[PDB]
Design an enzyme around this catalytic site. Structure first.
Site, short mmCIF file in Angstrom:
data_model
loop_
_atom_site.label_atom_id
_atom_site.label_comp_id
_atom_site.label_asym_id
_atom_site.label_seq_id
_atom_site.Cartn_x
_atom_site.Cartn_y
_atom_site.Cartn_z
N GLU A 123 -35.06 -16.08 49.04
CA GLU A 123 -35.68 -16.66 47.85
C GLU A 123 -37.11 -17.12 48.10
O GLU A 123 -37.88 -17.25 47.14
CB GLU A 123 -34.89 -17.84 47.29
CG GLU A 123 -33.52 -17.51 46.74
CD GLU A 123 -32.42 -17.73 47.75
OE1 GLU A 123 -32.73 -18.29 48.82
OE2 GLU A 123 -31.26 -17.36 47.48
N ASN A 181 -54.83 -27.95 61.61
CA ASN A 181 -54.86 -29.02 62.61
C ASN A 181 -55.67 -30.22 62.14
O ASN A 181 -55.27 -31.36 62.38
CB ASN A 181 -55.43 -28.49 63.93
CG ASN A 181 -54.71 -27.25 64.41
OD1 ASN A 181 -55.34 -26.32 64.92
ND2 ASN A 181 -53.40 -27.23 64.26
N1 LIG Z 1 -50.90 -27.14 65.99
C1 LIG Z 1 -51.22 -26.62 67.17
N2 LIG Z 1 -52.23 -25.70 67.27
C2 LIG Z 1 -52.55 -25.17 68.48
C3 LIG Z 1 -51.86 -25.56 69.62
N3 LIG Z 1 -52.38 -24.89 70.67
C4 LIG Z 1 -53.38 -24.09 70.22
N4 LIG Z 1 -53.50 -24.26 68.87
C5 LIG Z 1 -54.46 -23.57 67.99
O1 LIG Z 1 -54.78 -22.30 68.52
C6 LIG Z 1 -56.16 -22.04 68.38
C7 LIG Z 1 -56.66 -21.16 69.52
O2 LIG Z 1 -56.03 -19.90 69.49
P1 LIG Z 1 -54.70 -19.61 70.35
O3 LIG Z 1 -53.54 -19.22 69.46
O4 LIG Z 1 -54.36 -20.82 71.18
O5 LIG Z 1 -55.10 -18.40 71.33
P2 LIG Z 1 -54.07 -18.00 72.49
O6 LIG Z 1 -52.67 -17.97 71.95
O7 LIG Z 1 -54.19 -18.97 73.64
O8 LIG Z 1 -54.52 -16.52 72.95
P3 LIG Z 1 -55.82 -16.33 73.87
O9 LIG Z 1 -57.02 -16.97 73.21
O10 LIG Z 1 -56.09 -14.86 74.08
O11 LIG Z 1 -55.56 -16.99 75.20
C8 LIG Z 1 -56.83 -23.40 68.37
O12 LIG Z 1 -57.90 -23.41 67.44
C9 LIG Z 1 -55.75 -24.36 67.93
O13 LIG Z 1 -56.00 -24.79 66.61
C10 LIG Z 1 -50.84 -26.48 69.52
O14 LIG Z 1 -50.22 -26.83 70.52
N5 LIG Z 1 -50.52 -27.02 68.29
#
Ligand SMILES: Nc1nc2c(ncn2[C@@H]2O[C@H](COP(=O)(O)OP(=O)(O)OP(=O)(O)O)[C@@H](O)[C@H]2O)c(=O)[nH]1
Ligand SMILES: Nc1nc2c(ncn2[C@@H]2O[C@H](COP(=O)(O)OP(=O)(O)O)[C@@H](O)[C@H]2O)c(=O)[nH]1
Ligand SMILES: Nc1nc2c(ncn2[C@@H]2O[C@H](COP(=O)(O)OP(=O)(O)O)[C@@H](O)[C@H]2O)c(=O)[nH]1
Ligand SMILES: [Mg+2]
Lengths: 52, 437, 431, 219, 99, 431
Positions: free
Chosen positions: B254, B206
């Site tokens: 691949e 990010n």
């Molecule tokens: N590129 C991008 N990264 C995201 C986005 N939303 C969340 N993230 C990433 O996800 C990280 C947080 O972990 P998550 O995968 O969101 O955790 P979760 O899926 O909500 O699961 P829980 O924490 O248990 O609720 C953050 O540090 C972000 O970098 C998004 O919309 N785009």
């Protein structure tokens, strides 16, 4: 002197009379980012102007 | 007849999917309700949607994807959105509790009640197809749902469908920027439990997309939509050779035989670099040499894990648009003549070229512009060992004082699993060292 | 669908709860009659977290009101948004335990704990899923601390895995206001260390300082104080009621901010706070909210967050914002004030962005810090307690309702042990 | 430019912030007033005397050790562990170590009292008192019968400083440790307090031990 | 009233009290027998707002047969007291007949 | 994006700065409320030099108001364009300055200095370039002299590389209206000469002369005096704000008018300035602007430049004009009055032209003159200082307030060294 206005936005109190609908308000509720960005697009119909 | 099944685990995966399915609908002409416009057309042929869609006979192009999140919020806002009618209601799977940035909650207690239904929907989507190409899994290393449930579903998919290829589009944690606190713990645990069940894992950062959007697109306030649209461009560029037609091609198989040297090293980087806005898109020639040079610039990497600290193993070089098979050869020759870009001595033949004639698809309201050519690079570098080392140091700092271990220990997860993940990460560390020397 | 049941105990707790159910009813568009005079469907999609559907269109709050003075029930019913509550959820005694921990915990207040457990059980069984239990009370009163600690103990032993947050109006000496207040605070903190999943320490002196210095405000009363308290109560649980980008519920906050199972005494903060005159002369931006969060001026706990190190700091932002701006601002805060954060934790910041701001504001944020400077408040309460307990003043009551001096010694020594643990994790080296 | 943190002075292109003052969780805390072992002993009573020897000394008891009242003498013998102006330190620690081995069942009832003297000695962090207190703790649990099971409620309150000072050993390579005879290694003595707790405790002891010290694990 | 076998609507008697010392209003209920509902204060003494612009309820706009909205509750006035009628006529209101 | 922060200290400084901000506001098309009711795009192309954005599209000036006596803030808010300022920038004390440099420097102004530096840092962090600081004050009072010099010292300590220009008002023996003006001016020019990049000496006697003979005005008053000073203050930075053929900012002017570091005391000058009866007899051309610039009666300081040597001359021409005409009008005045220019600096005129003239003015021109004739004011103030310092008259206030006679003597000595340096560069030859 034991009741003032709110200290956050300093908005005055309301009598809560619903003589007007809830959409007609001066402090509306916000909208989601996904709703504002991801929007239905518009197709090219065909009866447009010729582009340069 | 080719088919790719998409699984979108976590909030990051679901939002990235909301970007990528919008991009797929825009580039295939499918309206948000599900039907073709039937009064206009864009032209792809009668079968250039079957990798991601299916025909019900009536004309309803219901897509793939197994959108899953333990919390209800993001799944129901997707259900109450523009693409409400597109998705099958049984595809969007949700729960009640949230894993709450806990690998233990994602893998041992909360996930297991929904693993069976997710697997049943995956089985139905696999029976619906004829020839399955691969499983495209969108998640974040992150915490909770995208870290634990993704690994559990990965284990179940490795048990059930052993030979099918898996891609692991994953949001890797930034070096300095972070959101969660137990994010290093979740990252190390999900790495440990994806090492023996992965096929190829793509990393996206990010902070690197933030700096790329600032430098190139000239936006100082980007949100997650501006990042997920770039990730959508990545996944579209990777799997457009299945859908559209062109020159020398590539399918999902691949991407592991020309990019994974050893069955540990399956974390290539992602680098799309005609990242240009409409203000400066037509004032410069976006030639093949220019865009490939800009792709091997380290400032355009979306990992921020600078490749000058290591050496390249393999580079899958995907080209999209008006790309000449001799111009790509000239660009790769004039970059292999450079001495700043360093390749390992045991891989002279370090490239895997794949060209499509389809131009990139713009999104209305998006930041990118319409370009004649595009480049997506999948570079498996030894430089990522420094990112592993930084997360190793963070894990050591937290685990030395036993901070945030009581949650994992008290809800599942016998204590030795933390040391198991740490030891496997250190094995990966000096595995990278030995394959680098 | 996740539900939270809310509880208010004591006079301070009941007033704070009344202001809270005014503020979030304003957020959710609830008429004081009880009807939904709202505007958006997102305002109703997650209204079940705090409310309950009544047949007719009314929305009954999931709140339970506790005191042993019926005048408090009369006052909270005669307040604005007073007819909102269901009169069954108005459980009260008759004695008026009134600044006596022993009366509120062991004697006649303990003849009311079975009835309030019955009504809380009835309100909790009518949920498909449950997050936890919300409590508002003051530690310097008999009903807030006595029945408060008894209720937390009972609900914790009944529901062991559902989480539980208390909002803990912890005493301050510069407001004084009660003689047996250190006794009540020391006898309440002993149970809040072991039973409460997470708690927010709030000082009336710090609230008064915020109102005088940052808000000017001339006369703040208790309405504005309870309004800041209700604002930081509403800002924490906005990810459970409104969607958006990266969000964190109560369990995520507890997991990411509690490193060890006892260091859960936090420090709240709400920081788009400006005076009436200097309201339109401002440009709401993420760096200036970060300014107003990370400032010793705008913290609602009368202990300076500079004689100690931040363990874990969480900020729940609200508004249509930039995640790059959020992460960049708080990362800059970490790097530049790196001396005030513990160095054995690499990133000491949790961020939760909800894109739906409170009504009237374009931008807001809620600060929750887990500092090692809470040992100042705990040491000052302990030194007041040992000043009173060296000569055994005001103890004939608390031994007349049937406690022992060993209980007081145990509570003092447990609070001292918590202070020592905070000192240890403040002064602990890198590696 | 010197600046205090979290302000406009703290955010400049050339300013540095002042470090917070330490709370002193690893420092000594000497008494402002002597214990009840300097008030009750030189006033009279305490039927003990020195018989002189070389290793330390020995305590000559003029009354039978097994018959004297442990409800009276023992908890206020532990009050003398918190000092150093010694003729008293031998009279404290050897009194402890003698009455414990020559007691019996009488140690177990007075255990609920036997906490405030111990914790007060622990919350002083003197490097020569603390090792003596840990060696007292290694002998309490081995002294009587069913004695390491009555401390299980009070694992909460005998273990706040053993958490702090368990990492207090030395990194001195392959140099010979000649301080092994005079057992004064806090970071080790804490470990043999904890394994003795596990060995002579009950079965729900470990859940509280890990609740206290985070980096302890099963023996 | 919804979903009741005894009535479909109810009337709860109300006595207002306008304190002229600080221009405050308190509503009270006269505690009818066998009501089965919690009767008592139902709005304590404060300065009740009148508009959304910050105006409050004064005595210059309170008359015999009118509706006053307080907190979403729209009370309707019926009759005054003798001293209140004398005071209001002294200040100059028309006192447009009890109902 | 070059931004400069305004400070206005004292009654004189605040009254000059109110007129300056009024002139800037109706030149940039800003109403008293703050909304842009302008017409051209150039009025908002470089609005960030003086203005900061707020919510609702409202521009707030980047200025701070400093005084000890609180009535001048009431006067400023009474004046038009008084509500446009941010209320947080009204940094006012409560007691009186006392017309005492020691009181304004070593006491309660020195207790308000932390707050005014806090607000200056707050208003300087909201910049991306921060070109410099300008300060308006008078060398006659305690807040203008002592608090202004303390502000200069703190700003120089904090931001050492940024430019500082002070539009200082100097006393006159003909105007006076203060008996401690020699002490105040002597003590303030000591700090001015060592911590200011450039300063403009404005004399009330010269202002009254300009108002009475070039303007033929019956009652001049401080409104028109501050109008002239404000026109000069605008004209020195119109090259920063509006585009033109030749651009000269504050650093350009500083490097082209300061040969030696303690020689930055300039006298300003404004043209055109005509009476009612002289409007007919007015050939609106560049030569009359040049002549009215170089005339000795039109100087904004009481010094006669014919009694000295022009080191450097800066000419800022606003309006629609040529380059050949402007350069030949700069050439011919040097060629004829070569006796009044130094012979060891050739071609000692700096010329800048901004394409945009001020509103209601077809052409305008700001004269700035670094000459050796400025030493008459310093000589006058030094001898008025020593005349009443020989008998230690009025020194008991300063000594009991906390200064030293050694400090007084050192300030007078530094003033004499400044005068001697001006004299030696006046009579220095070429070869
Ligand atoms: N590129 C991008 N990264 C995201 C986005 N939303 C969340 N993230 C990433 O996800 C990280 C947080 O972990 P998550 O995968 O969101 O955790 P979760 O899926 O909500 O699961 P829980 O924490 O248990 O609720 C953050 O540090 C972000 O970098 C998004 O919309 N785009
Ligand atoms: N913030 C706030 N504090 C209050 C309020 N009312 C009382 N307090 C504080 O609570 C303390 C007394 O606690 P109390 O409510 O009487 O506890 P109780 O006797 O058990 O009911 C006093 O020191 C007050 O400072 C209120 O409305 N708001
Ligand atoms: N040109 C001009 N001079 C002024 C104005 N106001 C005051 N002065 C001069 O400033 C001197 C007084 O300084 P003052 O403002 O009182 O300093 P302070 O006491 O520190 O605020 C007087 O001698 C006046 O001649 C004004 O509006 N314009
Ligand atoms: Mg989530």
């Amino acid at each position: 002197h034991a009741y003032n206005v709110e200290p956050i936005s300093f908005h005055p109190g309301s009598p809560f009379k619903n003589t007007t609908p809830g959409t007609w308000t001066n402090r509306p509720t916000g909208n989601s980012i996904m709703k504002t960005d991801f929007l239905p697009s518009q197709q090219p119909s065909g009866d447009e102007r010729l582009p340069a | 007849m080719r088919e790719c099944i998409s699984i979108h685990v976590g909030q990051a995966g679901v939002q990235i999917g909301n970007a990528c399915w919008e991009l797929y609908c825009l580039e295939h002409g499918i309206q948000p309700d599900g039907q073709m416009p039937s009064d206009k057309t864009i032209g792809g042929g009668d079968d250039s949607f079957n990798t991601f869609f299916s025909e019900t006979g009536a004309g309803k192009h219901v897509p793939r994807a197994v959108f899953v999140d333990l919390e209800p919020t993001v799944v129901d806002e997707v259900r109450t959105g523009t693409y409400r009618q597109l998705f099958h209601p049984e595809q969007l799977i949700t729960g009640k509790e949230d894993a709450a940035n806990n690998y233990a909650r994602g893998h041992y207690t909360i996930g297991k009640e929904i693993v069976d239904l997710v697997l049943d929907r995956i089985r139905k989507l696999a029976d619906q197809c004829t020839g399955l190409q691969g499983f495209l899994i969108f998640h974040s290393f992150g915490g909770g749902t995208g870290s634990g449930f993704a690994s559990l579903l990965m284990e179940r998919l490795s048990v059930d469908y052993g030979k099918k290829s898996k891609l692991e589009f994953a949001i890797y944690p930034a070096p300095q920027i972070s959101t969660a606190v137990v994010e290093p713990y979740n990252t190390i645990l999900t790495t440990h439990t994806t090492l023996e069940h992965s096929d190829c894992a793509f990393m996206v950062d990010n902070e690197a997309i933030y700096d790329i959007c600032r430098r190139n697109l000239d936006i100082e306030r980007p949100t997650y939509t501006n990042l997920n649209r770039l990730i959508a461009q990545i996944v579209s560029s990777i799997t457009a050779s299945l859908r559209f037609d062109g020159a020398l091609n590539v399918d999902l198989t691949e991407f592991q035989t020309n990019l994974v040297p050893y069955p540990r090293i399956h974390f290539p980087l992602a680098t799309y670099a005609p990242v240009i806005s409409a203000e400066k898109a037509y004032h410069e020639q976006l030639s093949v040499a220019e865009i490939t040079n800009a792709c091997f610039e380290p400032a355009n990497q979306m990992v921020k894990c600078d490749p000058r600290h290591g050496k390249y193993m393999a580079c899958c070089m995907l080209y999209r648009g008006d790309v000449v098979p001799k111009d790509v050869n000239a660009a790769i020759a004039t970059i292999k003549t450079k001495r700043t870009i360093q390749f390992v001595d045991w891989c002279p033949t370090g490239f895997k070229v794949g060209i499509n004639y389809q131009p990139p698809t713009v999104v209305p309201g998006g930041d990118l512009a319409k370009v004649q050519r595009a480049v997506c690079m999948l570079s498996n570098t030894t430089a990522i060992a420094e990112a592993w080392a930084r997360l190793d140091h963070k894990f050591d700092l937290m685990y030395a004082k036993r901070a945030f271990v009581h949650w994992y220990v008290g809800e599942g997860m016998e204590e030795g699993e933390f040391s198991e993940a740490r030891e496997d990460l250190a094995a990966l560390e000096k595995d990278y060292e030995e394959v680098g020397v | 669908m996740r539900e939270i049941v809310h509880m208010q105990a004591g006079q301070c707790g009941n007033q704070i709860g009344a202001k809270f159910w005014e503020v979030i009813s304003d957020e959710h568009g609830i008429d004081p009659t009880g009807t939904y005079h709202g505007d958006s469907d997102l305002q109703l999609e997650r209204i079940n977290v705090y409310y309950n559907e009544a047949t007719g269109g009314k929305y009954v709050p999931r709140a339970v009101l506790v005191d042993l003075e019926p005048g408090t029930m009369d006052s909270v019913r005669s307040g604005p948004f007073g007819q909102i509550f269901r009169p069954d959820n108005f459980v009260f005694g008759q004695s008026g335990a009134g600044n006596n921990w022993a009366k509120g915990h062991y004697t006649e207040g303990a003849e009311l704990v079975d009835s309030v457990l019955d009504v809380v059980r009835k309100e909790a069984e009518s949920c498909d899923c449950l997050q936890g239990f919300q409590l508002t009370h003051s530690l310097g009163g008999g009903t807030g601390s006595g029945m408060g600690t008894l209720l937390i103990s009972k609900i914790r032993e009944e529901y062991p895995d559902r989480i539980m947050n208390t909002f803990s109006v912890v005493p301050s000496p510069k407001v004084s206001d009660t003689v047996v207040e250190p006794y009540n605070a020391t006898l309440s903190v002993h149970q809040l260390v072991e039973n409460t999943d997470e708690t927010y320490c709030i000082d009336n002196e710090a609230l008064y300082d915020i109102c005088f210095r940052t808000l000017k405000l001339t006369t703040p009363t208790y309405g504005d104080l309870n309004h800041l308290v209700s604002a930081t109560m509403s800002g924490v649980t906005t990810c459970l009621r409104f969607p958006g980008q990266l969000n964190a519920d109560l369990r995520k906050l507890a997991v990411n901010m509690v490193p060890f199972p006892r260091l859960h005494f936090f420090m709240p903060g709400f920081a788009p706070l400006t005076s009436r005159g200097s309201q339109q002369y401002r440009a709401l931006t993420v760096p200036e909210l970060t300014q107003q969060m990370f400032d010793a001026k705008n913290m609602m706990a009368a202990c300076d967050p500079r004689h100690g190190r931040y363990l874990t700091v969480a900020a729940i932002f609200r508004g249509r914002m930039s995640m790059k701006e959020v992460d960049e601002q708080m990362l800059n805060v970490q790097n530049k004030n790196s001396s005030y954060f513990v160095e054995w934790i690499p990133n000491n910041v949790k961020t939760a962005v909800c894109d739906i701001p409170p009504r009237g504001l374009k931008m807001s944020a809620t600060f929750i810090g887990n500092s090692t400077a809470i040992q100042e408040l705990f040491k000052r309460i302990s030194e007041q307690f040992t000043a009173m307990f060296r000569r055994k003043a005001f103890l004939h009551w608390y031994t007349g309702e049937g406690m022992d001096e060993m209980e007081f010694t145990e509570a003092e020594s447990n609070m001292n042990d918590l202070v020592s643990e905070y000192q240890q994790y403040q002064d602990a080296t890198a590696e | 430019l010197k600046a205090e943190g979290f302000t406009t002075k703290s955010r400049m292109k050339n300013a540095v912030v002042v470090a917070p003052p330490a709370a002193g969780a690893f420092a000594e805390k000497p008494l402002l007033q002597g214990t009840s072992f300097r008030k009750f002993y030189n006033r009279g009573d305490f039927p003990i005397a020195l018989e002189h020897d070389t290793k330390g000394n020995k305590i000559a008891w003029k009354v039978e050790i097994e018959k004297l009242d442990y409800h009276h003498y023992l908890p206020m013998f532990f009050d003398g562990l918190c000092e150093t102006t010694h003729p008293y330190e031998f009279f404290a620690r050897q009194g402890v170590h003698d009455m414990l081995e020559h007691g019996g069942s009488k140690i177990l009832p007075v255990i609920p009292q036997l906490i405030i003297p111990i914790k007060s000695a622990l919350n002083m962090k003197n490097r020569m008192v603390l090792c003596t207190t840990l060696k007292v703790l290694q002998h309490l649990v081995v002294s009587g019968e069913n004695v390491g099971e009555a401390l299980v409620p009070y694992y909460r309150q005998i273990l706040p400083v053993l958490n702090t000072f368990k990492n207090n050993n030395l990194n001195s390579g392959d140099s010979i440790d000649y301080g092994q005879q005079r057992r004064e290694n806090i970071g080790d003595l804490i470990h043999e307090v904890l394994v003795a707790f596990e060995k002579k405790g009950g079965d729900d002891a470990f859940i509280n031990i890990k609740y206290m010290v985070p980096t302890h694990e099963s023996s | 009233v919804h979903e009741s076998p005894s009535e479909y609507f109810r009337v709860r008697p109300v006595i207002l009290y306008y304190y002229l010392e600080d221009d405050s209003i308190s509503v009270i209920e006269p505690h009818v027998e066998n009501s089965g509902m919690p009767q008592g204060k139902l709005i304590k003494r404060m300065r009740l707002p009148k508009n959304d612009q910050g105006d409050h309820w004064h005595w210059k706009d309170i008359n015999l047969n009118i509706n006053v909205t307080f907190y979403g509750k729209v009370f309707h006035i019926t009759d005054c007291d003798r001293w209140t009628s004398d005071f209001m006529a002294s200040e100059g209101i028309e006192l447009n007949a009890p109902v």
